Amino acid sequence: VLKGINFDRSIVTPENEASILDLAMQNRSGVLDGMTIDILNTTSNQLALFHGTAVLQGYGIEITRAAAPDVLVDTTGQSNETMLLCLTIDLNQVNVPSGTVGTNTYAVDYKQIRLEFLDVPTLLKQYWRDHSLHDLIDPRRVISMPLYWITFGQTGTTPLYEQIKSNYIDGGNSGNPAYGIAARCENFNHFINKVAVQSIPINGVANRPVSSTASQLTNYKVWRNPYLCSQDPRDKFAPDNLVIEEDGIYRIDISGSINIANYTFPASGNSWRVGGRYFQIVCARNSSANNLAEFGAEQHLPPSGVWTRRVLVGEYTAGMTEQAFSSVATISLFKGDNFFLQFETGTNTSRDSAYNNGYGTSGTHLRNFSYTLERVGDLNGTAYYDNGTF
């Protein structure tokens, strides 16, 4: 029958308002404030955490402050292991109330909530990002959120820790937690290698032209949303590739210029005319490598016929020292994909190349180059096939 949830005679239940808060959170779970490690109160038998608030699939969880230590987690028996400190909801457990709402003594022992140590495969099997308490097809009773990588040493030592920033809603994303910017950078200058195909380094290090003969690897300001993407973990691909952590339709914006752009000089033989040289800037996706996503999670397989390369800018050099370009596109990306940008031209400098024979500032380079990658849509349901192939 047709059942009302929010109607005059309805009873508003706990799952109901949890389902409402989950909707209000754009189906994202995470720590809203605090819940960071407290090293001062951390020993070889206990791990301490500061007070804070978290939302796990619409259920509000709080670590209360008093007097510190705000909370203590038992580390006894954990040694010579890398574990995940997890916040877990277990709906098979029973919450035990005590006292009364009449007196001012009502209290609850929330046995449905746990702070625990799990190994990577156990967490993955009950990770909120892949499974749900509210799931249509496979509804779960136990769900977890990883907070920290905890590396325990020998018995009697305090452990090493690494925050799982993808599970903390810190800032930059308040208001649109499941969307917004994935990656962005400030303007940078990058030397064009004398090759037909090359990636543009989008991860914070560019080969900056410094003199008339030399270029040097120089850092530039870059930012990544750890919930949406991360720098490739393999050092071969780390300067150029992003790993996508979340499926969706993304917008890619690029702008910059090609400086010291090559062309065929106007001479009497070519009727005093500029011979333009073809170049293109492409964005690309690649899913050949599995397990690139956080925790080595299984990649989300793209639909059949999915794109791999897309031209953003395709034109000829125009005989000027510097020529500007700009491009904006929406593209489908999948969890576990590599995402990168490529510059493409011919290799014959006297005939078809957009680059010259010079080096450093005297050689062809990208100048004032920048990009923004933003999640703008999801790939749930029908969209996966209708919108996911391009």
Minimum separation from the CB atom of position 344 to Zn ion (A): 27
Query: Contact between 25 and its own copies (CB under 8 A)?
Result: yes
Positive or negative torsion for Cα 333, 189, 214, 262: positive
Binding site annotation covers 335? yes
Q: Which of residues 86-145 bind Zn ion (CB under 5 A)?
A: 130, 134
x/- string (CB under 8 A) for its own copies, residues 308-337? --xxxxxxx-xxxxxxxxxxxxx-------
330 binds, among its own copies, Zn ion, none (CB under 5 to 8 A by kind): its own copies
Query: Contact between 362 and its own copies (CB under 8 A)?
Result: no
Q: What element of type H or E holds 25?
A: none
Binding site annotation covers 234? yes
Whether 355 and 345 have beta carbons less than 8 Å apart is answered as yes
Q: Which of residues 33-72 bind its own copies (CB under 8 A)?
A: 33-34, 58-64, 71
> Interacting stretch for Zn ion, rule CB under 5 A, among 18-26, 197-205, 270-278, 320-328?
18-26
Q: Which amino acid is residue 123, in one-letter code?
A: L
Q: Which of residues 183-242 bind its own copies (CB under 8 A)?
A: 184-187, 221, 223
**Cβ of 217: how many Cβ atoms within 10 Å?**
11
130 binds, among its own copies, Zn ion, none (CB under 5 to 8 A by kind): Zn ion
**Distance of alpha carbon 24 from its chain centroid, rounded?**
21
Interacting residue with its own copies among 74, 81, 109, 119 (CB under 8 A): 109
Contacts for 156-164: CB closer than 8 Å, 24+ residues apart: 156/44, 157/44, 158/39, 158/42, 158/43, 158/44, 159/42, 159/47, 159/75, 159/78, 161/37, 163/36, 163/37, 164/84, 164/294
x/- string (CB under 5 A) for Zn ion, residues 247-286? ----------------------------------------
**Cβ of 378: how many Cβ atoms within 10 Å?**
17
Collapse the DSSP code of 8 into the 3-class scheme (helix H, G, I; strand E, B; otherwise coil) and give the result: coil
Record the tokens describing residue 386, joined without a space. 């209708």
Minimum separation from the CB atom of position 214 to Zn ion (A): 39
Q: Which of residues 338-377 bind Zn ion (CB under 5 A)?
A: 374, 376
Q: Which of residues 244-273 bind its own copies (CB under 8 A)?
A: 249, 251, 253, 255, 257, 266, 271-273
User: In the sheet that 81-90 helps form, which strands lie side by side, from edge to edge?
Assistant: 113-118, 81-90, 142-152, 160-163
Q: How far is the C-alpha of 176 from the C-alpha of 181, rounded, in Å?
A: 10
Query: Contact between 296 and its own copies (CB under 8 A)?
Result: no
By CB under 5 A, the count of residues binding Zn ion is 5
Phi and psi torsions of 362, nearest 5°: -85, -10
194 binds, among its own copies, Zn ion, none (CB under 5 to 8 A by kind): none
Binding residues: 15, 19, 130, 199, 234, 240-241, 286, 288, 300, 335, 338, 342, 374
Report the interface residues with Zn ion, using CB under 5 A.
19, 130, 134, 374, 376
